[PDB]
Design a protein around this ligand. Structure first.
Ligand code: CL
Ligand code: CL
Ligand code: CL
Ligand code: CL
Ligand code: CL
Ligand code: CL
Ligand code: CL
Ligand code: CL
Ligand code: CL
Ligand code: CL
Ligand code: CL
Ligand code: CL
Ligand code: NA
Ligand code: NA
Ligand code: NA
Lengths: 132, 126, 132, 124
């Protein structure tokens, strides 16, 4: 008996009345709430979410420019071992900023890894396929 | 967050050196080993398999085609779950339970290609 | 070689401002607009849609009686060779009334045949799987 | 009406009695027979297959043994792969080779017994 199966799934999210789309993901088994931002490339974590994930903020090195302001400027790049939104994605790029971030952001780099990603007016539709 | 998913699967079984195909199924949550018989229609269960499944052999009524009692199996899972599947239990000795065409035909895809039996299915997921 | 494939698909429909869900199907190659009615069984076609599909209303025998909101109506049973809504369904039961009907109805007998059918927060979601 | 669909498919190949796996692929619409070689990375095309694909053998540049690198616009094996790396050997080649670079792109790839099983999912 050789057995193989694929899970083909969808997640549909209705636009919030505030005009944004939000999505809950499990990042290293921890539920984190993201705002979808098509202007973001990698994930942007709030300091509070980074700490929930067990990052030591004092050890991070802040080398990744994420703002055009002088002064407060660089975020610390991180890699997220596991991000589960329907399927599991591995080693996802992110950074942690400096504390002005109200809510963590999910950007195009992760979104573009879904088989399908569409924003159609008031809906966001994600289609995926995972082995097993 | 609305979420939905479908499992799309395949089961591939290599022909046994004895010339037959065998498949393990979970029938009402019990693992049962079937021999595939394309000449069979419904499932033929051995008495011992029937008893594992909780059938009381003394209550079954055994008519002809030697004699068999018709039964219905609540659940047969082979990749996906099939419900209320027809079978019978014979009073004569049956060496191994038989899986026939009535169940096999229900798969989205079913092919015997020389020495392989290939079953394709799609099931909703919870 | 062995090759086998399945098309796994979804249709998502937003609730009309009038409170109903509508779906366009291709019935014997002809686009028909249906209202979804979970309180219907077989398809109910308007006289005009039946005529679009080439039914001769004078040849139909109105042998059936449906118990509606307005009570008892006469109908002629029909079979629709092909109904495509994502996948193709074959020999689908329907009937045509004598005139009580503003828009054709798609009911539970067809909707139950989809792998998935869900109505959630002003959205109707149909999931299907078709061989090849 | 938002509509989306995915084609989910499998290809199963029985080991040839000669010990190898062979796979037919459509390369720029042309059916080409490949031997699977887990030791290969990119595709290796014979000169004859290259010609079937309309490559002019006199224009190829044999760089780096040397081979001539090429890019295949379309390789279909169940699903379509685009701009796949290959080369044409000058040293002889009996049968074109499909290697790990292309095989790894499949959702599932398994050599089980005397079977090779490829599972894919393609957006539509
Ligand atoms: Cl990423
Ligand atoms: Cl979009
Ligand atoms: Cl995916
Ligand atoms: Cl049990
Ligand atoms: Cl027996
Ligand atoms: Cl049955
Ligand atoms: Cl199935
Ligand atoms: Cl509207
Ligand atoms: Cl179909
Ligand atoms: Cl029906
Ligand atoms: Cl379906
Ligand atoms: Cl794939
Ligand atoms: Na028996
Ligand atoms: Na016995
Ligand atoms: Na060569």
């Amino acid at each position: 008996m050789y057995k193989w199966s694929t899970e083909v799934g969808e997640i549909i999210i209705a636009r919030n009345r505030d005009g944004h789309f939000y999505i809950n993901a499990f990042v290293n088994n921890v539920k984190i709430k993201f705002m979808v931002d098509t202007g973001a490339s990698d994930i942007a974590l709030t300091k509070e979410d980074a700490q929930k994930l067990g990052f030591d903020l004092t050890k991070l090195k802040y080398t990744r420019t994420y703002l055009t302001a002088n002064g407060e400027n660089k975020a610390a790049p991180i890699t997220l071992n596991s991000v589960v939104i329907g399927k599991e994605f591995k080693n996802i790029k992110g950074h942690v900023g400096l504390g002005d971030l109200d809510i963590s952001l999910l950007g195009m780099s992760l979104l573009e890894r879904f088989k399908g990603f569409r924003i159609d007016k008031d809906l966001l539709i994600l289609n995926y396929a995972a082995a097993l």
